[PDB]
């Protein structure tokens, strides 16, 4: 499998896209980011301008105005009008995030100090996943060599340290992902930047979120909500596979 | 002698507030420093567990030399002690009290022509839960805390059940820090209102009073409605911990999620209490060495009550990721848009300011203009993050960090550092070297913006906040980020330099307004330094 959904040396952008909601966010950020981008250009070359143009040693003596109407309307109508752009592309993209269509697989995933459970309730399977390198796993969260060589056994190498988990939630291809996330102790967080998902894991409620992958690959994720000594040392790894191995991977959990 | 402590005047606490919050505002960024070494390079190499077993002093200095990876057991608690603490203090003991604690209880009175505040004897005692709550918030840092180790790793807003399950009773220390700074800001906040409504000199109506003392009082009333709910909140927290409660237990019936609402009720108004303060600065700040008068004086005074007024009712921006339903999601991200129409009008008038006047580019001025560029990039990244939909990616990711640190540390901070070179004169009787001031400005130009913007990229890559360590792919730019951590450091040892010179043998001021005549309030109209009795 292709490791797509992680972070890159040096990057800037996005992580790769793999949904198409991860997509939409891509488009509405990149499309937010060229009005704000103008908006700072503009505000920084009036600023440089007039301090170039009214210098005191080319401006020596300074007007007095303290009034333009006109302007001032202009600058008050034409920010309500940006604003009200933005609104009319990202209302309808938060809908589409927030309204969770029918599953075709469903994942219980709940978040421990320091750990997350999944459990598939159409399937009854159930697993934990530790780091590559957690106490679980025999380490202490650092890079050693045994954790290397647990990481190159589990299909890996020494660059996915952090983000690599001795288990994987599996998931077809192409199939609507609907993952139900709560706390067991304390508030995590379940994401996956691929995805473009992203669920506080609180104690004593249960929020969904869904996702519809369009490739195969490995995608991770890090708990995102500060839950302690561990918080850095929760990642989540998720393996989108074919149909077929899907099933495969079903059938290897089935108690006879 | 003792008796700058016990002194009841309005300027002698201005200082005391302005010297306390940089002692503080040095303690918090040298926090940052050690932030910055470990997150300098992947793997842990700073916070090891090894030195706990060694001496509480002979463990510090072994933890600012680094170690190899296999002789260092990562220590997570350190870390988020660490970040706790630098955001506890940054967000209750530093700049809120020099912004409004220091330059609002010295100069609006000045600016209104009053002798001195309603209630002298309650301003002084301001001060001390001041230096109260900072005491008890360093000694949380020692006192056994999480995982049987010292101080509390929670967060600066301290969400339970995290909060309220953290071993030991540093976390109930850093609630009464927390209860001890609103009771200051409380006791503060009575004496500006109270201040402004009726001690103004004959002939200063409404309409005549300054910007700055209007930024005071708009922040004042702030300070009425939200740091009475903080209470009530971290209150909570302290009977959920030590008195039997479940208000955010689920077992008992509760729920975290509640508490978040009130926090919040409370946090996002926190944060237009800093900034409301640094607004009034610029304005006195720009029209001085622009040799203007401040564009459009009246929506200046509006737009700061209309930033002050929704600043209360979009709080649930903290939570697009806690669980709030769809419609909610879309209020607050609609409310949230708002407030960058009265914003703008700040931002576009102080560059109608600058617009056919003198500039001269004196240090103070620099401070200003650096705010108009950096706040503005701060403040168009938190409308990126008001959108709900993009939101669900960089919440929790350096991204919001590189927001929120350019509109404060490169915001309200240059708001700071822009009071004072312009005061310090007026305060001190004593300038400060104008190439000083300019270096320093130059330095921490450069420094925190290479501290923060490459956070954009790390949030954009998915790195998330509270984290000791990171992915090997993260390196590249938490290296710069270090790197501009270390440059902005040494431009405030350097800016410590500069006051310390100027203090003790700087130029002897001698002109009332050592500025022009554009600095037209009235403390421009007194001595340098005012006299000890005013109006
Ligand atoms: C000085 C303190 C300060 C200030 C002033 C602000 C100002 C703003 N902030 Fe920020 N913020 C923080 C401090 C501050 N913030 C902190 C500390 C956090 C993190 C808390 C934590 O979790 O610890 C935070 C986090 C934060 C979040 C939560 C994100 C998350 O956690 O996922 C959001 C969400 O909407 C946000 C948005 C805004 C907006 C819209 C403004 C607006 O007020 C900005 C408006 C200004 C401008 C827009 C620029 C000028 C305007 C123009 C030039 C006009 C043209 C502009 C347009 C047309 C857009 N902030
Ligand atoms: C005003 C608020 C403020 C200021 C000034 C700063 C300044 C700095 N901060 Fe920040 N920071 C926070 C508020 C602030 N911070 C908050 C609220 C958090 C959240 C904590 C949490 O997650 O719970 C945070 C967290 C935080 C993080 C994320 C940590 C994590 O997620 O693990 C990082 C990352 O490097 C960091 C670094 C720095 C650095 C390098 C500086 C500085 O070194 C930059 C250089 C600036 C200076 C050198 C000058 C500073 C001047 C003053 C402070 C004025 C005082 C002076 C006088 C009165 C004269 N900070
Ligand atoms: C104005 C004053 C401001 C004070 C600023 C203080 C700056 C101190 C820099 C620390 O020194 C560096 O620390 C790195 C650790 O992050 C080391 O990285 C190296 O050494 C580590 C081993 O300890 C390896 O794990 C790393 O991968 C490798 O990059 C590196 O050798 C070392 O020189
Ligand atoms: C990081 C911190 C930032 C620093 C902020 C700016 C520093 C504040 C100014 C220093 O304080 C001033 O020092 C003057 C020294 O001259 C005092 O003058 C005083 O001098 C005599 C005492 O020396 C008194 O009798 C007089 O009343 C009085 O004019 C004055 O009262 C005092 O306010
Ligand atoms: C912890 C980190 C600390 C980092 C410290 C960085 C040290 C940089 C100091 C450079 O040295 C100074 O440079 C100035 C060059 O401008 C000189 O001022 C000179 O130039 C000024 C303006 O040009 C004149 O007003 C002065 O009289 C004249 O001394 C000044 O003499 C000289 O000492
Ligand atoms: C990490 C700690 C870093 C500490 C940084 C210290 C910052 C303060 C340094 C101020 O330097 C002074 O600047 C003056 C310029 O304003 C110089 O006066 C010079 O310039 C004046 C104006 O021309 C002359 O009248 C003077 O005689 C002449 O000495 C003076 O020499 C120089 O020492
Ligand atoms: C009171 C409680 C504790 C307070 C802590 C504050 C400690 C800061 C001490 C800094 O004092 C400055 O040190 C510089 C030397 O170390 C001197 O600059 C000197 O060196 C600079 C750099 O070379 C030159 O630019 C200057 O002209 C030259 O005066 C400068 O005169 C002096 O005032
Ligand atoms: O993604 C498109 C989106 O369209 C509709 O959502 C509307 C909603 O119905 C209106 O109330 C409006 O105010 O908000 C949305 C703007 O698109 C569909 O209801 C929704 O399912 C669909 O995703
Ligand atoms: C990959 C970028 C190298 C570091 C750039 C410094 C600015
Ligand atoms: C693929 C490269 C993407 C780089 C985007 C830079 C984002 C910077 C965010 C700061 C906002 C600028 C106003
Ligand atoms: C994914 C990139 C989206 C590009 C959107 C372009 C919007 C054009 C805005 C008009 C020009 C403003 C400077
Ligand atoms: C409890 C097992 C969780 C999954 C472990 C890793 C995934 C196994 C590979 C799945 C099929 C890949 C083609
Ligand atoms: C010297 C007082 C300021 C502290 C500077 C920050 C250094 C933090 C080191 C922490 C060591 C762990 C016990
Ligand atoms: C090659 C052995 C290590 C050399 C680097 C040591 C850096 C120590 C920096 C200490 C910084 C203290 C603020
Ligand atoms: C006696 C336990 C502490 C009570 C604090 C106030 C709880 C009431 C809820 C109010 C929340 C703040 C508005
Ligand atoms: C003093 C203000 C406190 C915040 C009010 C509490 C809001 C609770 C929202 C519950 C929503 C449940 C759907
Ligand atoms: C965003 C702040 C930019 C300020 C530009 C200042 C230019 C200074 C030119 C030199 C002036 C004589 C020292
Ligand atoms: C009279 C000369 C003007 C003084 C300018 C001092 C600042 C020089 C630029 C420093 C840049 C450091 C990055
Ligand atoms: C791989 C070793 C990197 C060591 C870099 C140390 C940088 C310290 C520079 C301090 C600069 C302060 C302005
Ligand atoms: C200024 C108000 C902005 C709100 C706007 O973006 C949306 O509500 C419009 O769909
Ligand atoms: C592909 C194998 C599916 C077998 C199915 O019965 C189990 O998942 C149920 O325990
Ligand atoms: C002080 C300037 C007031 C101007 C303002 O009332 C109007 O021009 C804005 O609509
Ligand atoms: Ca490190
Ligand atoms: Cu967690
Ligand atoms: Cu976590
Ligand atoms: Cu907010
Ligand atoms: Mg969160």
């Given at each position: 499998?292709?490791?797509?959904?992680?972070?890159?040396?040096?990057?800037?952008?996005?992580?790769?896209?793999?949904?198409?909601?991860?997509?939409?966010?891509?488009?509405?950020?990149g499309?937010?980011?060229?009005?704000?981008?103008?908006?700072?250009?503009?505000?920084?070359?009036?600023?440089?301008?007039?301090?170039?143009?009214?210098?005191?040693?080319?401006?020596?003596?300074?007007?007095?105005?303290?009034?333009?109407?006109?302007?001032?309307?202009?600058?008050?109508?034409?920010?309500?009008?940006?604003?009200?752009?933005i609104?009319?592309?990202?209302?309808?993209?938060?809908?589409?995030?927030?309204?969770?269509?029918?599953?075709?697989?469903?994942?219980?995933?709940?978040?421990?100090?320091?750990?997350?459970?999944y459990?598939?309730?159409?399937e009854?399977?159930?697993?934990?996943?530790?780091?590559?390198?957690?106490?679980?796993?025999?380490?202490?969260?650092?890079?050693?060599?045994?954790?290397?060589?647990?990481?190159?056994?589990?299909?890996?190498s020494?660059?996915?340290?952090?983000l690599?988990?001795?288990?994987?939630?599996?998931?077809?291809?192409?199939?609507?992902?609907?993952?139900?996330?709560?706390?067991?102790?304390?508030?995590?967080?379940?994401?996956?930047?691929?995805?473009?998902?992203?669920?506080?894991?609180?104690?004593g409620?249960?929020?969904?979120?869904?996702?519809?992958?369009?490739?195969?690959?490995?995608?991770?994720?890090?708990?995102?909500?500060?839950?302690?000594?561990?918080?850095?040392?929760?990642?989540?790894?998720?393996?989108?596979?074919?149909?077929?191995?899907?099933?495969?991977?079903?059938?290897?959990?089935?108690?006879? | 002698?003792?008796?700058?402590?016990?002194?009841?005047?309005?300027?002698?606490?201005?200082?005391?507030?302005?010297?306390?919050?940089?002692?503080?505002?040095?303690?918090?960024?040298?926090?940052?420093?050690?932030?910055?070494?470990?997150?300098?390079?992947?793997?842990?190499?700073?916070?090891?567990?090894?030195?706990?077993?060694?001496?509480?002093?002979?463990?510090?200095?072994?933890?600012?030399?680094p170690?190899?990876?296999?002789?260092?057991?990562?220590?997570?608690h350190?870390?988020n002690?660490?970040?706790?603490?630098?955001?506890?203090?940054?967000?209750?003991?530093?700049?809120?009290?020099?912004?409004?604690?220091?330059?609002?209880?010295?100069?609006?009175?000045?600016?209104?022509?009053?002798?001195?505040?309603?209630?002298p004897?309650?301003?002084?005692?301001?001060?001390?839960?001041?230096?109260?709550?900072?005491?008890?918030?360093?000694?949380?840092?020692?006192?056994?805390?999480?995982?049987?180790?010292?101080?509390?790793?929670?967060?600066?807003?301290?969400?339970?059940?995290?909060?309220?399950?953290?071993?030991?009773?540093?976390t109930?220390?850093?609630?009464?820090?927390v209860?001890?700074?609103?009771?200051?800001?409380?006791?503060?906040?009575?004496?500006?209102?109270?201040?402004?409504?009726?001690?103004?000199?004959?002939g200063?109506?409404?309409?005549?009073?300054?910007?700055?003392?209007?930024?005071?009082?708009?922040?004042?009333?702030?300070?009425?409605?939200?740091?009475?709910?903080?209470?009530?909140?971290?209150?909570?927290?302290?009977?959920?911990?030590?008195?039997?409660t479940?208000?955010?237990?689920?077992?008992?019936?509760?729920?975290?999620?509640?508490?978040?609402?009130?926090?919040?009720?409370?946090?996002?108004?926190?944060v237009?209490?800093?900034?409301?303060?640094?607004?009034?600065?610029?304005?006195?700040?720009?029209?001085?060495?622009?040799?203007?008068?401040?564009?459009?004086?009246?929506?200046?005074?509006?737009?700061?009550?209309?930033?002050?007024?929704?600043?209360?009712?979009?709080?649930?921006?903290?939570?697009?990721?806690?669980?709030?339903?769809?419609?909610?999601?879309?209020?607050?991200?609609?409310?949230?848009?708002?407030?960058?129409?009265?914003?703008?009008?700040?931002i576009?008038?102080?560059?109608?300011?600058?617009?056919?006047?003198?500039?001269?580019?004196?240090?103070?001025?620099?401070?200003?203009?650096?705010?108009?560029?950096?706040?503005?990039?701060?403040?168009?990244?938190?409308?990126?993050?008001?959108?709900?939909?993009?939101?669900?990616?960089?919440?929790?990711?350096?991204?919001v960090?590189?927001?929120?640190?350019?509109?404060?540390?490169?915001?309200?901070?240059?708001?700071?550092?822009?009071?004072?070179?312009?005061?310090?004169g007026?305060?001190?009787?004593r300038?400060?070297?104008?190439?000083?001031?300019?270096?320093?400005?130059?330095?921490?130009?450069?420094?925190?913006?290479?501290?923060?913007?490459?956070?954009?990229?790390?949030?954009?890559?998915?790195?998330?906040?509270?984290?000791?360590?990171?992915?090997e792919?993260?390196?590249?730019?938490?290296?710069?980020?270090?790197?501009?951590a270390?440059?902005?450091?040494?431009?405030?040892?350097?800016?410590?330099?500069?006051?310390?010179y100027?203090?003790?043998?700087?130029?002897?001021?001698?002109?009332?307004?050592?500025?022009?005549?554009?600095?037209?309030?009235?403390?421009?109209?007194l001595?340098?330094?005012?006299?000890?009795?005013?109006?």
């Amino acid at each position: 499998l292709e490791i797509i959904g992680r972070p890159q040396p040096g990057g800037t952008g996005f992580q790769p896209s793999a949904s198409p909601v991860a997509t939409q966010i891509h488009w509405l950020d990149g499309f937010i980011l060229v009005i704000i981008a103008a908006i700072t250009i503009f505000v920084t070359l009036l600023i440089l301008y007039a301090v170039w143009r009214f210098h005191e040693k080319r401006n020596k003596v300074p007007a007095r105005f303290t009034h333009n109407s006109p302007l001032a309307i202009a600058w008050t109508i034409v920010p309500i009008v940006i604003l009200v752009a933005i609104g009319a592309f990202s209302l309808p993209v938060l809908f589409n995030q927030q309204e969770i269509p029918e599953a075709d697989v469903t994942v219980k995933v709940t978040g421990y100090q320091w750990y997350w459970g999944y459990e598939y309730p159409d399937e009854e399977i159930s697993f934990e996943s530790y780091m590559i390198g957690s106490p679980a796993t025999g380490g202490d969260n650092r890079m050693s060599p045994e954790v290397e060589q647990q990481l190159i056994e589990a299909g890996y190498s020494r660059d996915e340290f952090l983000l690599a988990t001795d288990t994987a939630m599996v998931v077809p291809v192409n199939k609507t992902v609907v993952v139900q996330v709560t706390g067991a102790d304390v508030i995590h967080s379940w994401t996956v930047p691929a995805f473009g998902v992203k669920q506080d894991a609180v104690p004593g409620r249960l929020a969904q979120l869904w996702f519809r992958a369009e490739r195969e690959g490995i995608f991770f994720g890090q708990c995102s909500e500060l839950c302690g000594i561990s918080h850095a040392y929760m990642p989540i790894t998720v393996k989108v596979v074919s149909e077929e191995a899907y099933a495969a991977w079903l059938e290897q959990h089935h108690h006879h | 002698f003792t008796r700058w402590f016990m002194s009841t005047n309005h300027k002698d606490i201005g200082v005391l507030y302005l010297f306390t919050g940089g002692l503080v505002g040095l303690i918090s960024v040298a926090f940052t420093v050690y932030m910055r070494m470990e997150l300098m390079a992947p793997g842990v190499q700073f916070m090891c567990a090894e030195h706990l077993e060694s001496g509480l002093v002979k463990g510090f200095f072994q933890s600012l030399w680094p170690s190899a990876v296999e002789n260092c057991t990562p220590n997570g608690h350190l870390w988020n002690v660490m970040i706790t603490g630098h955001g506890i203090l940054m967000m209750f003991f530093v700049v809120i009290p020099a912004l409004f604690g220091g330059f609002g209880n010295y100069f609006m009175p000045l600016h209104i022509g009053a002798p001195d505040m309603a209630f002298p004897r309650m301003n002084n005692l301001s001060y001390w839960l001041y230096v109260a709550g900072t005491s008890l918030a360093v000694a949380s840092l020692f006192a056994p805390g999480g995982n049987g180790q010292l101080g509390s790793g929670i967060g600066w807003v301290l969400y339970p059940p995290l909060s309220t399950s953290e071993s030991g009773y540093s976390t109930d220390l850093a609630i009464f820090a927390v209860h001890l700074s609103g009771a200051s800001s409380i006791l503060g906040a009575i004496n500006m209102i109270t201040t402004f409504l009726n001690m103004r000199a004959p002939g200063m109506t409404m309409h005549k009073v300054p910007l700055f003392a209007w930024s005071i009082f708009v922040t004042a009333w702030l300070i009425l409605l939200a740091l009475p709910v903080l209470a009530g909140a971290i209150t909570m927290l302290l009977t959920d911990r030590n008195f039997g409660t479940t208000f955010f237990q689920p077992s008992g019936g509760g729920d975290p999620v509640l508490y978040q609402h009130i926090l919040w009720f409370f946090g996002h108004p926190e944060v237009y209490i800093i900034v409301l303060p640094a607004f009034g600065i610029v304005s006195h700040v720009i029209a001085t060495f622009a040799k203007k008068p401040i564009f459009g004086y009246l929506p200046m005074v509006y737009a700061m009550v209309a930033i002050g007024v929704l600043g209360f009712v979009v709080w649930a921006h903290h939570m697009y990721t806690a669980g709030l339903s769809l419609t909610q999601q879309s209020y607050f991200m609609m409310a949230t848009m708002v407030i960058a129409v009265p914003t703008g009008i700040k931002i576009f008038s102080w560059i109608a300011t600058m617009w056919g006047g003198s500039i001269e580019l004196k240090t103070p001025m620099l401070w200003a203009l650096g705010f108009l560029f950096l706040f503005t990039v701060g403040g168009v990244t938190g409308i990126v993050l008001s959108q709900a939909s993009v939101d669900r990616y960089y919440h929790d990711t350096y991204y919001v960090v590189a927001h929120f640190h350019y509109v404060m540390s490169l915001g309200a901070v240059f708001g700071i550092f822009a009071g004072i070179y312009f005061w310090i004169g007026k305060m001190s009787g004593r300038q400060y070297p104008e190439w000083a001031g300019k270096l320093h400005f130059w330095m921490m130009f450069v420094g925190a913006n290479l501290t923060f913007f490459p956070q954009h990229f790390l949030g954009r890559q998915g790195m998330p906040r509270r984290y000791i360590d990171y992915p090997e792919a993260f390196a590249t730019w938490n290296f710069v980020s270090s790197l501009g951590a270390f440059l902005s450091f040494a431009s405030f040892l350097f800016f410590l330099g500069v006051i310390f010179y100027t203090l003790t043998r700087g130029a002897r001021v001698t002109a009332n307004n050592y500025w022009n005549e554009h600095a037209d309030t009235l403390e421009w109209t007194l001595t340098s330094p005012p006299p000890e009795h005013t109006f």
